[PDB]
Design a protein around this motif. Structure first.
Motif, PDB file in Angstrom:
ATOM      1  N   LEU A   1      48.646  46.875  32.780  1.00 20.90           N
ATOM      2  CA  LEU A   1      47.737  46.807  33.921  1.00 20.90           C
ATOM      3  C   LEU A   1      48.557  46.705  35.208  1.00 20.90           C
ATOM      4  N   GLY A   2      49.278  47.780  35.519  1.00 12.51           N
ATOM      5  CA  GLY A   2      50.097  47.848  36.715  1.00 12.51           C
ATOM      6  C   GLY A   2      49.355  48.472  37.879  1.00 12.51           C
ATOM      7  N   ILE A   3      48.076  48.124  37.997  1.00 13.27           N
ATOM      8  CA  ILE A   3      47.229  48.583  39.090  1.00 13.27           C
ATOM      9  C   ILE A   3      47.806  48.072  40.399  1.00 13.27           C
ATOM     10  N   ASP A   4      47.347  46.888  40.785  1.00 17.42           N
ATOM     11  CA  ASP A   4      47.914  46.152  41.899  1.00 17.42           C
ATOM     12  C   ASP A   4      47.912  44.675  41.499  1.00 17.42           C
TER      13      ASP A   4
ATOM     14  N   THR B   1      38.655  47.926  42.955  1.00 15.19           N
ATOM     15  CA  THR B   1      39.735  48.762  43.483  1.00 15.19           C
ATOM     16  C   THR B   1      40.717  49.109  42.359  1.00 15.19           C
ATOM     17  N   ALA B   2      41.235  50.334  42.371  1.00 18.60           N
ATOM     18  CA  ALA B   2      42.131  50.792  41.312  1.00 18.60           C
ATOM     19  C   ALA B   2      43.224  51.728  41.833  1.00 18.60           C
ATOM     20  N   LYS B   3      43.946  52.351  40.904  1.00 18.28           N
ATOM     21  CA  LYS B   3      44.983  53.328  41.229  1.00 18.28           C
ATOM     22  C   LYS B   3      44.721  54.641  40.495  1.00 18.28           C
ATOM     23  N   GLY B   4      45.778  55.428  40.319  1.00 21.23           N
ATOM     24  CA  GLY B   4      45.695  56.686  39.597  1.00 21.23           C
ATOM     25  C   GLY B   4      46.383  56.635  38.247  1.00 21.23           C
ATOM     26  N   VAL B   5      45.621  56.949  37.198  1.00 17.47           N
ATOM     27  CA  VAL B   5      46.085  56.953  35.807  1.00 17.47           C
ATOM     28  C   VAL B   5      46.456  55.546  35.328  1.00 17.47           C
TER      29      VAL B   5
END
Length: 224
Positions: A43-46, A199-203
């Motif tokens: 879980l290396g989102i933020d 809120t999230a990221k990509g992949v």
RNA sequence: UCGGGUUUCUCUGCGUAGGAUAGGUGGGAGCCUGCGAAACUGGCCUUUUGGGGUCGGUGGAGGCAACGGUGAAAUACCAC
């Protein structure tokens, strides 16, 4: 050392998926006693925000190599329904004295409907900041301390998250087969990739690695 | 000489209680003789309260985590 005949069969350059790794995972273990193998995620989102910390449960399918922990606090026809089944340290409000006098290694400190005020008026200055209490929306409120404690029975619960970017819920025990090291691994990508709050990221799924009592790591693929 | 990335070899990480920086989940009690643990004196990486690595005189070789101590979780043995 004793690194060989277990690292030799291993290459960190190839892949071992769901139906090939779980049969070459009880191998990568030949140490001493029983030997369970981890299943990693990321879980290396933020990871430095309080809206990217997973605060939800997991429920293992079958039965692990353990028992069940639920420190019930009841009274009446709720005493012969949690002691004659398979919970843990069950009785009455005496449990206040058993969860305030120095023994909080329990899990879901259960309660009665009309008796949440016992866990709320005395142990709110103690159990208050634990977040290990029966909420009217969590898991075990009301008179469902027999079939949704079977979510603390039919599922090694637990819930945690960190601040670097490593998250790895385990399968349970390698005291099963290769269609049960990936049927308990069918409760890891079935209870840990439902973590996108606002809120999230990509992949999300980037890869996958492993862990035992002597390693090592054959990168678990992701797909069909 | 400056730019950054990758990959191998390397380590900081006391707002809280804990003797002594616990960095995480499992096999949570054993093997370890095959890759940086004690704290006297003009030390740097963390910054002249204590704490891994110390240049040199000084020179008991087997061990620990722990039950306890203790936090939603503990201080070691294999690792991501």
């Amino acid at each position: 050392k004793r690194y060989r005949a277990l690292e030799g069969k291993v290459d960190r350059n190839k892949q071992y998926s769901i139906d090939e790794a779980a049969a070459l995972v009880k191998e990568l273990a030949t140490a001493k006693f029983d030997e369970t193998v981890e299943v990693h995620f990321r879980l290396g989102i933020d990871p430095r925000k309080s809206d990217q910390n997973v605060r939800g449960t997991v429920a293992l399918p079958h039965g692990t190599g353990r028992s069940v922990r639920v420190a019930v606090i009841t009274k009446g026809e709720n005493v012969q329904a949690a002691e004659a089944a398979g919970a843990d340290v069950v009785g009455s409000d005496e449990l206040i004295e058993r969860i305030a006098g120095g023994f909080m290694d329990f899990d879901a400190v259960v309660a009665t409907p009309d008796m949440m005020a016992q866990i709320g008026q005395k142990l709110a200055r103690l159990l208050g900041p634990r977040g290990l209490l029966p909420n009217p929306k969590s898991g075990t409120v009301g008179a469902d301390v027999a079939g949704m404690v079977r979510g603390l029975k039919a599922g090694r619960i637990e819930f945690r998250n960190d601040k670097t970017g490593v998250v790895h819920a385990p399968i349970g025990k390698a005291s099963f087969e290769s269609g049960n090291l990936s049927a308990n691994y069918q409760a890891l990508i079935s209870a840990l990739e439902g973590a996108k709050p606002g809120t999230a990221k990509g992949v999300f799924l980037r890869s996958a690695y492993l862990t035992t009592t002597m390693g090592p790591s054959i990168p678990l693929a992701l797909g069909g």
